[PDB]
Design a protein around this nucleic acid. Structure first.
Lengths: 276, 182, 245, 169
RNA sequence: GAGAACAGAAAUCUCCAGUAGAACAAAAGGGUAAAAGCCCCCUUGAUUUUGAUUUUCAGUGUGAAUACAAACCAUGAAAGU
RNA sequence: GGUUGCGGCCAUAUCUACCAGAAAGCACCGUUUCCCGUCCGAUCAACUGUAGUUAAGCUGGUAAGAGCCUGACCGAGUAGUGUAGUGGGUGACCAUACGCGAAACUCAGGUGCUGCAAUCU
């Protein structure tokens, strides 16, 4: 229970602070690109780790607030064949490939930059409120972006498979990783011992019985498919805003007008404390 | 599609700040408020002016750098960039010259007394009876060499060492407060 | 032991100086659209700019204590205020200092034609970057206060004066074209806050080398009426227009 | 309604104080290490009280935070030896309690006087489905004012599962 | 404060929380709240090469240091710092 | 439009209690070899929406709720500051009069809108 001077003098945090959606402290270290060499556009990277979602985008800083130009998702997988795992490490690497292919085709180079030349980009990452470490899906997706055609400044001390005691990159473990080693290895090392955990995981993959070899065939075919087509034609948006708002607007509360609310006050003065 | 405009008073450029200045004449009400063609007309006039700008500002010297990824106070390989001259105007500074000049009664000594200021070689000096390099000042070094050993062979004289050094640095501080008052 | 010492040695002077910093402390009278006014109008010198939270019953042009205090204490040189009344309605202060003192105090009557950036179709931008300026009219060089407001913008919206430059972040411009001719001793033409862009196109006679530039109008299309003007010392010119050497 | 909202345990933090730093501290602590597996860390005695045998940055606090199935087991033991009945007090305003058992010898091991066999105190933590907003750094958010268990709910829970009884309110 | 059997007026665990009086080589109008407020890792910095101050009796195609710039430096995944 | 992500401006933006949360992002919450992290799978992390999914997450109204913005020269052309004087003048000075100029209380209005990829029966 706060006083009058307290809450009539005190201050608020920022709106975007009220949520875990921005680390303005590093946003202020990034909005400073260097920033003292000279002007050159911003190319930043946004990753958010949500359930069922793989949100990876690239913004343009504007006074209109932002215009995120590049964006990645999870639902354009059937055209590449593999469709499952809209979150996992194969997903990270795959979307790292796919964003590369789409932004490639949208620059329109492979098969204004005034007279010189192609000028390949360098897109960085603003970390967000996910902590930075090694051995995870984030830097696998980074590998995917690189081997798709992005050029990001980084070190490999983060690439899952990185040794930090004797600084050793394991290309064998990384290759197994890439073709489905850690995940399907967990599958088989759980499966030789129990089937309940094995069934709890890979909820459809248990029904299609795709072994690491076959999902690595999936890996290869999907790799070549990403390198082939960054098509990404979205939903037609059947039942447009009108019908979407028929759903999202059939059971919403709107404002109670001043006449009605003053009549509620009239109830308050007639029956509540107006002597029953 | 054109490139050359007519300036009855040909315009000037000032490129360290990317500016152009025209000294032509304008009719009184050509740009007035009550215009609803204010947008089109003034925007077309400055359109001609910035046409002049972009026709002017492209055949300048550049600076190609043959270095690749890792240019510390510079660029990568892929680009080639445009430079800026100094503008013909003196914009307002923020201060006078950030000067610092004095005598401190020691500079007069350096000049009149034939004393060349020392060369500040280094710090890690060699102390015998040790077998190592330990700095003249920087790790309990040649400064603190009496508050360490076990017996001195001359009221403990170690504390006296420390208090003497305190008087010394205080004399330093007094002759520094003088110099910074003057 | 060195934080407010790195900050302090920044606050200290320079020879080839940095950018200059701005100060926006609201006066005793503001409005919501004035909050909008400040953001939309100074919307480029973000980051390097200062805003405040509260109000001041202040007279800028008579004494020069209070804002001098604030500016010395915040390490800046570009004081701004929006001073309102019945007669001097919308007589804002756009004043530059010099050495924590003040050089000349400028107050512009800000006109009632406020057209914000949302007054037209929204667009993109590269925030904070260094703009271009164009100045048409011989009055911009023969009219002393037009020269003053000219250089005021020319040192406020100047940015980091760095040699190396690239076409990419070279997009935006101010259009300065005074509201017609003049003569000395009569009601004056007004200035036009005209924020525009430069968009590249083949000239069919300039072609690959020379483009054809088209500007788009989005705002914030504002206007400026002159206000109250100071005229400082000539020793100020002696200290202000020199070389480090 | 309770579709999913329960009061599972989060962690059991022990609270042991010593009026001296030495082999006694380390003896009870090695006992803690065999009890838990996670080495009982040392926390600083905040500053001196001079009446109790404590000074500044002394490292005299030793607490263990037990979780996992071992937690259910240690609670079943640490109530069974309490006869499944605790005293009137210690019900937290959060839905928990901190209670101690005299002479932990009473369960299992023998004495061995020269290893540290003393009285201890536990403090339990509960949780509600929806209260994981504190733990996750991102999505930093609030909880309902009624969706949080309190003194009334910890009396309810001391009545609830584990079937404990209260020794005269 | 609600809690807090050995242990209590100041011994250890939560909660509401004090938007702070967070704690600042402070004094600020203010002011950093993923912090300048703690501890866990990492390391050298009194580097060298060049224009202005001068400047030496081998008056050393600049030897001395000052300021400025780079080149490297440590960190980090990272733009950065 | 719900919102996913970023925001622009930072209480109309929060705190205090419900109800709705019907779609889908949205979360709650189950498992633990290898990457892994510490006193611990407390946080991260190998899995899908997996087991539980509307109770918090989260928007809204619901309340003259508390707290905050605009305007009524509304006070207010207020006092006052230099602008005429042997006006006023024993003295703590007030005027006419012109440059400018109120402020608060006061009287009411309101408690968040935009942009880009996305999914909706």
């Amino acid at each position: 229970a706060k006083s009058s001077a307290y809450s009539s003098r005190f201050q608020t945090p920022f709106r975007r602070r009220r949520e875990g959606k921005t680390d303005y402290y590093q946003r202020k270290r990034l909005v400073t690109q260097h920033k003292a060499k000279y002007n050159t556009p911003k190319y930043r990277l946004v990753v958010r780790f949500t359930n069922k979602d793989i949100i990876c985008q690239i913004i343009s800083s504007t006074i209109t607030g932002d215009v995120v130009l590049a964006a990645a998702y999870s639902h354009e997988l059937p055209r590449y064949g593999i469709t499952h795992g809209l979150t996992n490490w194969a997903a990270a690497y795959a979307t790292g490939l796919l964003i590369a292919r789409r932004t490639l085709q949208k620059l329109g180079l492979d098969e204004e930059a005034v007279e010189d030349g192609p000028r390949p980009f360098k897109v960085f990452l603003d970390i967000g409120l996910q902590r930075t470490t090694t051995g995870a899906r984030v830097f696998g997706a980074l590998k995917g972006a690189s081997d798709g055609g992005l050029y990001v400044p980084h070190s490999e001390n983060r690439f899952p498979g990185w040794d930090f005691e004797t600084e050793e990159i394991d290309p064998e473990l990384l290759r197994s990783y890439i073709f489905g080693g850690h995940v399907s290895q967990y599958m088989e090392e759980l499966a030789d011992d129990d089937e309940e955990r094995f069934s709890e995981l890979f909820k459809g993959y248990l029904a299609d019985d795709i072994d690491a070899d076959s999902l690595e065939d999936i890996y290869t075919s999907a790799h070549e498919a990403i390198r082939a087509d960054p098509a990404f034609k979205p939903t037609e948006k059947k039942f447009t805003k009108e019908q979407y708002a028929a759903e999202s607007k059939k059971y919403r509360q709107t404002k109670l007008s001043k006449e009605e609310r003053a009549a509620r006050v009239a109830a308050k003065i007639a029956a509540l404390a107006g002597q029953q | 599609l054109p490139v050359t405009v007519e300036k009855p008073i040909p315009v000037v450029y000032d490129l360290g700040n990317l500016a152009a200045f025209d000294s032509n004449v304008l009719d009184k009400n050509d740009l007035d408020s009550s215009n609803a063609r204010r947008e089109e007309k003034i925007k077309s006039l400055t359109r001609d002016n910035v046409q002049l700008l972009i026709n002017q500002l492209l055949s300048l010297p550049m600076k190609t750098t043959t270095e690749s990824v890792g240019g510390t106070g510079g660029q990568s390989s892929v680009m080639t960039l445009l430079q800026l001259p100094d503008p013909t105007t003196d914009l307002p500074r923020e201060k006078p010259l950030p000067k610092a000049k004095a005598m401190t009664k020691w500079e007069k000594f350096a000049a009149k007394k034939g004393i060349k200021p020392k060369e500040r070689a280094g710090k890690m000096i060699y102390d015998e009876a040790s077998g190592e390099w330990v700095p003249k000042w920087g790790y309990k070094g040649a400064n603190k060499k009496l508050d360490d050993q076990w017996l001195v062979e001359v009221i403990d004289p170690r504390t006296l060492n420390r208090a003497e050094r305190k008087r010394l640095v205080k004399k330093n501080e007094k002759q520094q407060r003088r110099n910074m008052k003057n | 032991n060195a934080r407010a010492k790195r900050a302090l040695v920044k606050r200290e002077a320079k020879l080839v100086e940095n950018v200059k910093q701005a100060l926006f402390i609201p006066g005793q009278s503001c409005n919501k659209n004035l909050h909008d006014i400040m953001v939309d109008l100074s919307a480029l010198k973000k980051p390097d700019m200062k805003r405040f939270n509260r109000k001041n019953d202040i007279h800028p042009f008579e004494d020069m204590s209070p804002l001098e205090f604030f500016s010395e204490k915040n390490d800046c040189s570009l004081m701004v205020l929006m001073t309102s009344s019945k007669k001097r309605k919308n007589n804002m202060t756009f004043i530059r200092t010099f050495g924590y003192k003040i050089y000349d105090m400028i107050e512009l009557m800000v006109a009632d034609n406020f057209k914000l950036l949302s007054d037209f179709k929204k667009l993109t931008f590269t925030v904070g970057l260094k703009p271009m300026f164009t100045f048409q009219g011989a009055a911009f060089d023969t009219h002393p206060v037009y020269k003053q407001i000219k250089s005021l913008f020319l040192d406020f919206f100047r940015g980091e004066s760095t040699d190396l430059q690239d076409v990419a972040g070279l997009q935006h411009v101010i259009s300065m074209t005074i509201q017609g001719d003049f003569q000395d001793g009569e009601p004056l033409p007004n200035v036009l806050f005209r924020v525009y862009k430069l968009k590249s196109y083949k000239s069919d006679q300039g072609g690959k080398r020379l483009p054809r530039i088209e500007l788009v109008e989005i705002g914030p299309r504002l206007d400026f009426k002159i206000g109250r003007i100071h005229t400082p010392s000539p020793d100020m010119v002696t200290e202000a227009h020199k070389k480090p050497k | 309604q309770n579709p999913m909202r329960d009061l599972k345990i989060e962690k059991l933090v022990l609270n042991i104080s010593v009026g001296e730093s030495g082999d006694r501290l380390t003896r009870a602590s090695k006992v803690l290490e065999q009890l838990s597996g996670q080495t009982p860390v040392q926390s600083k005695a905040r500053y001196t009280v001079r009446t109790f045998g404590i000074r500044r940055n002394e490292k005299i606090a030793v607490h263990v935070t037990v979780r996992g199935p071992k937690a259910e087991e240690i609670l079943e033991r640490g109530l069974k030896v309490k006869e499944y009945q605790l005293r009137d007090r210690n019900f937290s305003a959060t839905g928990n309690f901190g209670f101690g058992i005299d002479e932990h010898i009473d369960l299992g091991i023998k004495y061995d006087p020269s290893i540290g066999i003393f009285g201890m105190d536990f403090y339990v933590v509960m949780n509600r489905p929806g209260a994981r907003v504190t733990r996750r750094k991102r999505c930093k958010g609030t909880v309902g004012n009624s969706h949080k268990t309190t003194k009334e709910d910890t009396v309810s829970w001391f009545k609830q599962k584990y079937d404990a009884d209260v020794l005269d309110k």
